[PDB]
């Protein structure tokens, strides 16, 4: 129930330690063995999954962090302690981009795994390691190689198998007033929403029907009361995608003759991402007549050019959604990921 956000942070990989050059007196002993050991290997920033949070402000509040430099070698052949690896917790579904090779090292799907984004450097070599008789005086110093300069660009994509997008006040936010437990601030006035809402559906024994929401817009690059354009970002990861159509508005846009435009904003972004499956399910039938409804549904579905099976339920009153629940659940069990 709070405003979405995303940003990027500046993280510098830990650089390796430096070799140590040291000579020592002992009591009345002028000349002794070379003193000074290795340095400290640089830190390794890690990415931990976050299931028990959804916040991203911890990236604007703290933008620059430095992994501790590997401590220089000390006397008495004391090597430098490895810099502690700082773990940056990240919410699930954050694809990472780099300045340069703008390809993702790996998408974050499960909870409880760690991914390396910047390996630490290499420790230096002290003069003790360089003991020899060719020089007969080990005093040269070998500095540690700096860690890799990786810059992270973070965008969040929510994990949900089913997502809601549709016309204003058409029931996209009302869809969660179903058997789901989430209750976003939904009504019957323009756009009903600013923040995406997520809800779960318990069916039977580990079968899940997490529902995603996005606030759509009008005719693409247009808006009614300042609603943003870049809200398709949280979508585009749903294996099953549903769409709602405004039915008999008091003064709103006409029937499916306007839905020819609705085809466009799916492919507007780049390509609709290989034309993910789309089912045209209707809503708000409780205030209409079913005997009046079949002639519209026979006309709405076919005027656009869609001939597949159309689902006709009233999500406003939360009745008849069960057959969708079984059928969609049937889709996953009959079509796993491959």
């Amino acid at each position: 129930m709070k405003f979405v956000d995303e940003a990027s942070i500046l993280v510098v990989a830990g650089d390796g330690g430096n070799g140590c050059v040291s000579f020592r007196r002992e009591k009345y002993i002028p000349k002794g063995g070379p003193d000074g050991g290795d340095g400290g290997d640089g830190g390794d920033v890690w990415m931990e999954a976050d299931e028990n949070l959804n916040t991203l402000i911890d990236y604007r509040f703290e933008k620059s962090f430095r992994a501790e430099r590997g401590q220089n070698g000390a006397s008495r052949d004391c090597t430098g302690k490895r810099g502690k690896d700082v773990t940056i917790k990240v919410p699930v579904g954050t694809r990472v981009i780099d300045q340069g090779t703008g390809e993702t090292m790996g998408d974050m799907t499960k909870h409880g795994q760690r991914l390396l984004v910047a390996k630490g450097g290499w420790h230096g070599l002290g003069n003790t390691r360089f003991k020899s008789s060719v020089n007969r005086t080990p005093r040269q110093k070998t500095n540690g190689t700096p860690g890799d300069k990786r810059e992270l660009l973070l965008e969040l994509m929510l994990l949900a198998d089913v997502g809601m997008l549709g016309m204003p006040n058409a029931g996209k936010s009302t869809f969660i007033r179903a058997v789901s437990a989430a209750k976003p601030k939904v009504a019957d006035y323009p756009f009903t929403t600013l923040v995406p809402s997520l809800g779960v559906v318990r069916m039977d024994n580990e079968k899940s029907f997490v529902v995603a929401d996005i606030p759509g817009l009008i005719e693409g690059a247009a808006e009614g009361a300042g609603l943003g354009i870049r809200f398709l970002k949280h979508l585009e990861r749903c294996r099953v995608l549903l769409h709602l159509i405004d039915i008999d508005p008091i003064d709103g846009t006409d029937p499916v003759e306007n839905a020819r435009i609705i085809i466009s904003e799916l492919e507007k972004y780049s390509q609709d991402l290989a034309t993910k499956p789309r089912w045209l399910v209707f809503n708000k039938i409780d205030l209409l007549d079913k005997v009046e409804a079949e002639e519209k549904a026979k006309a709405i579905a076919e005027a656009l050019g869609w001939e597949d099976k159309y689902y006709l339920i009233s999500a406003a009153s939360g009745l008849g959604v069960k057959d969708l629940c079984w059928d969609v659940m049937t889709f996953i069990i009959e079509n796993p990921v491959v």
């Binding site: 129930m1 709070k2 991203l56």
Partner: protein
Amino acid sequence: SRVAKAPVVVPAGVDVKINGQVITIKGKNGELTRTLNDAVEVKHADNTLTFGPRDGYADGWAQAGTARALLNSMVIGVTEGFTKKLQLVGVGYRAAVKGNVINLSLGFSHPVDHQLPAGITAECPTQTEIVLKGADKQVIGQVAADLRAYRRPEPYKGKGVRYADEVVRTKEAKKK
């Protein structure tokens, strides 16, 4: 300073007994007695009270105005009384009064029994309302604070014990 020079008027029926630096405001609604640092002398003039400092100490008017201020609380408390109202916001929050023991249900693992002081009377007009009545503003303020300190209103939803006049701010932080 100018507060000390401002006279305070006492209504009829409230006796003032001066025995040096101890002053009694016994009247219609109880008995109150306080002591000073001896830095202010009170003058028994006509039906009002005036205050003044003495030479030798630098504080002077600073504490002189206080004695006028504190006595203002006592005179009203013995003829009108101070009323403090507190309300419970949230599900599972219950308050009740039995004798001089105040019982509260704030989601803890056990009901909390709070003992009131000598000069405070508390009542519950409804299930989620507490009203405090007393003769001294000093005691009623601490008791009202003491009830508030148990479940201080957390900003996010305001669930807890709050003052009636105090307003709680609801803010959206830690998005999602």
